[PDB]
């Protein structure tokens, strides 16, 4: 058949313990020096399209 197979159901406890590292880390959001919508460090502000001057359209 399907050669190595689990021997016993993994308990609600054991299953959950394994998920103690699955939690997403929230982005470190910065506020744009211009358009004043929040942005990602080292990226162009989505809203105004600025990164010192304006690079992207809108």
């Amino acid at each position: 058949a399907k050669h190595p197979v689990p021997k016993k159901k993994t308990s609600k406890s054991k299953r959950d313990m394994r998920r103690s590292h699955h939690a997403l880390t929230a982005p470190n959001l910065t506020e744009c020096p211009q358009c004043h919508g929040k942005k990602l460090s080292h990226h162009i502000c989505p809203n105004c399209g600025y990164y010192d001057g304006r690079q992207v359209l809108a």
Binding site: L40, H43, I44, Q55
Partner: protein, 113 residues
Amino acid sequence: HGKAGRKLNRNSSARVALARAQATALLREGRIQTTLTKAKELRPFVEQLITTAKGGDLHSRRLVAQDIHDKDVVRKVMDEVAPKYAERPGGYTRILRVGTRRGDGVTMALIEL
């Protein structure tokens, strides 16, 4: 280990096709939006292309034609762009990071000259 120093993600032929492909795009358009990595690999190949063109002689032209298979882009690079870069000690390529895509979730970037 692997202390080499280059970067592919396809087969020999393809790595060269992509390089030349995007190099023609940037040189023709002046600014292209692509994947970050893809853009990173492009930066030196295109930067090296400008230096060849910065020769001005037929050989320098013919050398560019080995990578740029567009009759017009080769003229744009030879006669227009390379001369404008005359006193720039190499460096005209800048990469800005735009931000994550929907499908693959890939972080996009801009590359302009």
